[PDB]
Each structure stands twice: as C-alpha cells, then as structure tokens.
Amino acid sequence: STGSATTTPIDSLDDAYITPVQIGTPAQTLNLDFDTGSSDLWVFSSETTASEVDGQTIYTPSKSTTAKLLSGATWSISYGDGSSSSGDVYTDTVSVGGLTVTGQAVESAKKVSSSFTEDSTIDGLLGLAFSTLNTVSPTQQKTFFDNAKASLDSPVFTADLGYHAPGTYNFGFIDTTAYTGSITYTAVSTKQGFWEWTSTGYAVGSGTFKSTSIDGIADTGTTLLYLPATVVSAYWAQVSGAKSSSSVGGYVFPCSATLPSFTFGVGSARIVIPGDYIDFGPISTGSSSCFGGIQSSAGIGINIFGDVALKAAFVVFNGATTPTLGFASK
Ligand SMILES: C[C@@H](c1nc(N)nc(N(C)C)n1)N1CCCCCC1
Numbered sequence: 001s002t003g004s005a006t007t008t009p010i011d012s013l014d015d016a017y018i019t020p021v022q023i024g025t026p027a028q029t030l031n032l033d034f035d036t037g038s039s040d041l042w043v044f045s046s047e048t049t050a051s052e053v054d055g056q057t058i059y060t061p062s063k064s065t066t067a068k069l070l071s072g073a074t075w076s077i078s079y080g081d082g083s084s085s086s087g088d089v090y091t092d093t094v095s096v097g098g099l100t101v102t103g104q105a106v107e108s109a110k111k112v113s114s115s116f117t118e119d120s121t122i123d124g125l126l127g128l129a130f131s132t133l134n135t136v137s138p139t140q141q142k143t144f145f146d147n148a149k150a151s152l153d154s155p156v157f158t159a160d161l162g163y164h165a166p167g168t169y170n171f172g173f174i175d176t177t178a179y180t181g182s183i184t185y186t187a188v189s190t191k192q193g194f195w196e197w198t199s200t201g202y203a204v205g206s207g208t209f210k211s212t213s214i215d216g217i218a219d220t221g222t223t224l225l226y227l228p229a230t231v232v233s234a235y236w237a238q239v240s241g242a243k244s245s246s247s248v249g250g251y252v253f254p255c256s257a258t259l260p261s262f263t264f265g266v267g268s269a270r271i272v273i274p275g276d277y278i279d280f281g282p283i284s285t286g287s288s289s290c291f292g293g294i295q296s297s298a299g300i301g302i303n304i305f306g307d308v309a310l311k312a313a314f315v316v317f318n319g320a321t322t323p324t325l326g327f328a329s330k
Contacts, residue, residue, distance in 0.1 A: 002153055004169075005020060006097075014164060016121075017167070028057075031121065034125075035126065035128060036218055036220040036221065037221045038127040040133075042125055043108060043124035045059045046060040046061070061108065073089035087109040090106045129143070133193035145157055151172075157169060157172070159220055159310060159315045161310055174316060179314035182328060195219075199214040199264050200214075214303055218310060219304050219310075221306075225306055235262055236294070250291065254288060256288070261273060264305075266327040313330065316328075
C-alpha cells in the first residue's frame with residue numbers, strides 16, 4: 001500500500017504545516033501537524049476542556065462506530081517549545097492520503113496548553129519519530145508509520161515541504177519526479193528516539209564550505225533551524241545590523257536586509273537553503289526588526305534541522321531494519 005497527502009502552511013510565514021487526516025467511521029477529518037520529532041498522535045476532542053478549545057476541529061469518539069476506549073491508558077507530553085497536552089486514549093481507524101491503519105492509538109486531549117488553544121489551525125499532532133518516545137502509559141503505543149510499515153510497498157515516508165506553498169507527505173514510495181539529482185543517504189541513530197544524523201558541515205552564502213560534524217535531528221514539527229552558537233554567529237555576521245537579542249529571544253535582523261543562503265552537508269552532497277527561507281518577518285506587527293530562521297541550539301541540548309532546513313530538500317525517512325535518512329535537492 002501507499003498514501004499521499006498534501007501538507008499546507010498554517011500561515012504566510014510557514015510557522016507549521018497541517019495535513020488532513022481521516023479518523024473514525026464515518027470519517028472525521030482533522031488537520032494535524034506531522035511531527036518527525038515526536039511519537040504521539042493526539043487530537044483536540046469532545047473531551048478537551050471547553051475553555052481550551054478555540055476554533056479547532058474536534059474528534060468525537062462517541063460518533064465513531066470503530067472507536068474503542070483503550071482502557072486505563074493515559075498520555076501526557078511536553079514539547080521543546082514549552083507547550084503540552086494530556087488525556088486518555090482510543091483506538092480507531094486512521095487514514096492519511098488513502099493509507100489506512102486500523103487499531104491506531106488516537107490520544108484524546110483532556111487538557112492542552114495555551115499555545116495549542118491559541119492556534120486555531122492545528123487540530124492535533126501526528127508523531128513520526130520512533131515509537132520508543134510514545135508517552136502512552138501503562139502500555140506504550142505505536143506511531144501511524146510503525147503500524148503501517150509492514151503493509152507499505154517500501155518501509156519509508158517522505159517529507160517534501162514547500163516554501164510559502166503546499167507540499168507533500170508520501171508513505172510507502174519515493175516519488176522520483178519530486179527531486180532533482182540523486183538522494184544522498186546518511187546514517188541515523190535511534191538511541192534518543194529521533195531521526196538523528198550527522199551533517200558534514202556548512203557554508204554561509206557564497207563562502208567556503210566548513211567541514212565539521214553537526215549531530216542533529218530531522219524535525220518537521222520545529223519551525224526553525226537550530227545549530228551550534230559558533231555556526232549561527234558565522235551566519236548572522238554576514239547580515240548588517242543583525243544581533244542576538246535576549247529580550248526578543250534570538251537573532252533579529254533589519255527587515256530591509258537581503259539574507260544570504262545557508263548550505264548544509266549531507267555526506268558529500270550539499271543542500272542550499274535560500275536566504276528568503278530564513279526570514280520570519282517582523283518580531284511584532286509593524287516592526288522593522290525581523291526574526292531570523294537560523295537560531296542557536298545552545299541550551300536546547302540538541303541541534304534541530306527543522307522546517308527551514310527540511311523545506312529546502314526532498315527528505316526520505318527510511319524505516320528499514322537499519323533506518324537511514326535521505327536528502328535530495330529539488
Ligand atoms: C519574536 C517572536 C518571533 N517572531 C517571529 N517573527 N517569528 C518567530 N518564530 C519563532 C518563527 N518568533 N518570538 C521569538 C521566539 C522566542 C520567544 C517568543 C517570541
């Protein structure tokens with residue numbers, strides 16, 4: 001089997017992407033944030049505290065003839081941005097782009113933190129990291145991809161995120177029309193539950209490539225590119241007026257700037273992030289100070305190849321017995 005679904009930016013800045021997902025019988029379509037940095041499929045629901053729901057579409061398990069309470073199971077998750085959610089668990093039929101999993105754990109939110117409430121466009125998350133990170137207790141549950149894997153034509157999914165435009169998540173096949181040149185595959189460590197890999201270095205604009213190992217995670221659920229302070233300082237030093245602002249929370253730059261590109265290495269191959277991809281616009285409405293799309297990972301404890309990086313590539317998440325990651329230009 002295969003599946004193919006379009007993923008769409010939630011706003012004009014590509015702060016996140018949403019992908020329609022069919023849950024239950026008859027189908028209830030919710031727009032979920034596909035997140036290769038976590039491993040829970042959770043949704044706003046009829047059980048979510050009413051004051052914490054503000055415009056989201058909810059899953060109502062009582063209206064699904066295939067929903068079954070997973071007795072005694074609860075979940076609770078906290079994300080790198082400080083957001084969180086928790087609740088109980090159903091199993092139900094879940095389909096993405098024509099690919100159907102029966103008996104998928106659908107984690108129903110009883111509580112969500114304010115950032116979730118405040119974002120009307122995201123109805124929940126669909127985790128695509130390794131199932132070892134799944135938070136369901138006392139019986140850990142599998143991701144949608146893990147459940148689907150054995151049925152797929154090939155044990156892979158691909159992320160093809162757009163810049164200020166829709167893109168695609170495919171399951172079970174590689175669309176050879178979706179990228180240019182070849183796909184370069186690179187080793188993955190699953191030890192922390194992530195799609196963790198080591199970039200071979202970087203360049204800023206037209207500058208020379210610096211060969212240096214940068215361990216980090218391919219994370220579709222993180223907006224920005226978080227890298228070591230040394231790398232980030234080298235990038236922003238090429239932008240007149242750019243500075244790190246503790247009050248704002250990162251590097252900012254004059255909105256009048258033209259940003260240089262940023263290149264990262266994948267083995268001997270190179271992925272170029274155009275300068276425009278690194279512009280996240282005014283820090284507040286009407287400001288001429290703009291927020292940068294490359295930020296320091298110092299304090300996070302891990303480097304994160306988020307959407308800013310991933311959207312510049314066609315990315316293969318290869319879930320074979322020994323997982324790997326592939327990157328192609330596009
Ligand atoms: C300045 C703001 C911001 N502005 C823009 N334009 N874009 C962003 N991102 C995160 C894309 N973030 N946040 C900075 C981040 C930490 C503290 C909270 C405030």
